[PDB]
Design a protein around this ligand. Sequence first.
Ligand code: AES
Length: 186
Amino acid sequence: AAIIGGNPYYFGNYRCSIGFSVRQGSQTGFATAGHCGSTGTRVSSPSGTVAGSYFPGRDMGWVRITSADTVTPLVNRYNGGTVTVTGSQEAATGSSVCRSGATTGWRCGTIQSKNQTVRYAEGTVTGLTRTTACAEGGDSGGPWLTGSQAQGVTSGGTGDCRSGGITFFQPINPLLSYFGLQLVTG
Ligand SMILES: *S(=O)(=O)c1ccc(CCN)cc1
């Protein structure tokens, strides 16, 4: 099947959301949150393995997939259709931004503050961008877009999408750099 940002993937007892399709030389996969699974973790739908994961400290990872699935430059818009990712030009503080994830679909907000530190129960994570968008469990790893420009993957936050909350993302460019990944674009 097509790898599409915002769609679910599974491992053991858990669900996270695909971030962005990526390539590493001849290999393919998708960016995600580090906390979704440590290096070597097997995943299903799509079949893959966590090829890299830095969490805590950062919250960045990627999953290498198999020939049974195909990378796309697409993100699920959760209204029947998709958004095409054309690059990863970083949006400014104050910009609108939207995220996609398997539990709450498409949700939007504003980028409030960058380089934020959050003391998660598993350990402290730095370098995060705080937004006013909401998220819920299952949405983690999912992509953030300002227009057609990739911003990050969902790391954490508080509250929910019924009553609202705040949400943190791991910026995408540090993730691509750390793991030596190329973003799949259209
Ligand atoms: S995960 O990083 O999308 C995530 C986001 C938000 C929550 C809200 C829990 N209070 C949980 C998991």
